[PDB]
Design a protein around this nucleic acid. Structure first.
Ligand SMILES: Cc1cn([C@H]2C[C@H](O)[C@@H](COP(=O)(O)OP(=O)(O)OP(=O)(O)O)O2)c(=O)[nH]c1=O
Ligand SMILES: [Mg+2]
Ligand SMILES: [Mg+2]
Length: 377
DNA sequence: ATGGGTCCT
DNA sequence: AGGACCC
């Protein structure tokens, strides 16, 4: 009801992982490269004009000193990612992952247990750790301010444990819901944290300049909104609910308009172990079924290596292509395959899936291949 | 875009 | 299967 949520966001995650592995890159401008893309870079490269998801040409022209490491193989980032979520689950077991480098934790039971243990004089007494959003004055007689401040202390303990046990730096935002925790975690970067008091909530949401900056409003929704003349957070706040419902549907319209007021009642959900494992490769051109099979075989072998080490097994396989969005075909994995030479029965499954989507007697042009193990039991 | 993930329809 | 969203 009245919650205290923390959002944890690792600093330049892949680059942090690469710098830890090779402390020779730690003092140097660093970009993590995938194909032609600099997906992320350290804060030294960001100074020199390098931005995330920048073209490798644009980056090294903007920064000739820029060291590049290849981050196509996600193995090590994925491993570090789970170490961070496991560490946070020791604080409170209900930790929600968002991608590889973000976690939400509902701190509210932890805050209340800590509060129960303090005396009268000990409230006097309670102090923030890190920044207060908008430099708002704390009122220690306001129980909501008190609970949020205890939230900030837990957030700092979390960041200190991540640093002490894992070597990782990150930001945290503490607020009354997920939306606001996530929006506030980014106010001071890198390696800082911020707490949002209730009175400054409107200030945070109106500080955004693009409607797409709201988590939950993506590329297609934003473009839709733009067509409707909705550009600021206030435009969306004040736009006719009826016209919005008609344009985007009851569900999207009501959720995002709620989000435009800073309102978000979604619970922090326990992510637990993953729902799926997948491996992807992208390329300029694939036009031969023989090469496609070879491609699919490599993706398989990596997937089987992961299958596997978590211990539990997938009950369905999916193959995703991109021609020239995506197309896919899935089917169950036979139970005699599941109990785990698996490779040779597995590839024929995938090629049958391939040939259903791709008429191989007719010239084709693929730019992506992806195998997914899902429906784990 | 890359190389992943999520849940809903 | 596809389509939104998130990183
Ligand atoms: C958005 C995005 C992220 N990523 C990866 C690279 C990032 O290191 C990791 C976390 O993403 P982000 O948190 O968005 O970025 P970051 O941790 O690199 O930098 P920041 O300090 O601003 O938080 O996810 C992709 O590979 N492709 C993408 O499109
Ligand atoms: Mg970020
Ligand atoms: Mg990050």
């Amino acid at each position: 009801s009245s919650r205290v949520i923390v959002h944890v966001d690792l600093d330049c995650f892949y680059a942090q992982v690469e710098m830890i592995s090779n402390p020779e890159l730690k003092d140097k401008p660093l970009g993590v490269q995938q194909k032609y893309l600099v997906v992320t870079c350290n804060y030294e490269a960001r100074k020199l004009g390098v931005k995330k998801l920048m073209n490798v040409r644009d980056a090294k022209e903007k920064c000739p000193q820029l060291v590049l490491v290849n981050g196509e193989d996600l193995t090590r980032y994925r491993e570090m990612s789970y170490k961070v979520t496991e560490l946070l689950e020791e604080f409170s077991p209900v930790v929600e992952r968002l991608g590889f480098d973000e976690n939400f934790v509902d701190l509210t039971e932890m805050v209340e247990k800590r509060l129960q243990q303090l005396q009268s004089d000990e409230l006097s007494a309670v102090t923030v750790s890190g920044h207060v959003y908008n430099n708002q004055s704390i009122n220690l007689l306001d129980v909501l301010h008190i609970r949020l401040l205890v939230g900030s202390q837990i957030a700092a303990e979390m960041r200190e444990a991540m640093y002490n046990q894992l070597g990782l730096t990150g930001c945290a935002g503490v607020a009354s819901n997920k939306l606001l925790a996530k929006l506030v975690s980014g106010v001071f970067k890198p390696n800082q944290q911020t707490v949002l008091l209730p009175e400054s909530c409107q200030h945070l949401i109106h500080s955004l300049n693009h409607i797409k900056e709201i988590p939950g409003i993506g590329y297609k929704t934003a473009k839709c909104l733009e067509a409707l003349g909705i550009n600021s957070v206030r435009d969306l706040q004040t736009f006719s609910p009826k016209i919005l419902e008609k344009e985007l549907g009851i569900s999207v319209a009501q959720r995002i308009q709620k989000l435009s007021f800073g309102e978000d009642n979604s619970p922090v959900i326990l992510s637990g172990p993953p729902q799926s494992f997948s491996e992807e490769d992208s390329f300029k051109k694939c036009s031969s079924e023989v090469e496609a099979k070879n491609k699919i075989e490599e993706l398989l072998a990596s997937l089987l290596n992961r299958v596997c080490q978590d211990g539990r097994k997938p009950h369905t396989v999916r193959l995703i292509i991109r021609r020239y969005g995506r197309e896919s075909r899935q089917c169950p994995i036979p139970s005699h395959v599941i109990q785990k030479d698996v490779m040779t029965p597995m590839v024929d499954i995938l090629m049958k899936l391939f040939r259903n989507m791709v008429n191989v007697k007719m010239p084709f042009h693929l730019t992506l291949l992806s195998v997914c193990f899902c429906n784990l039991k």
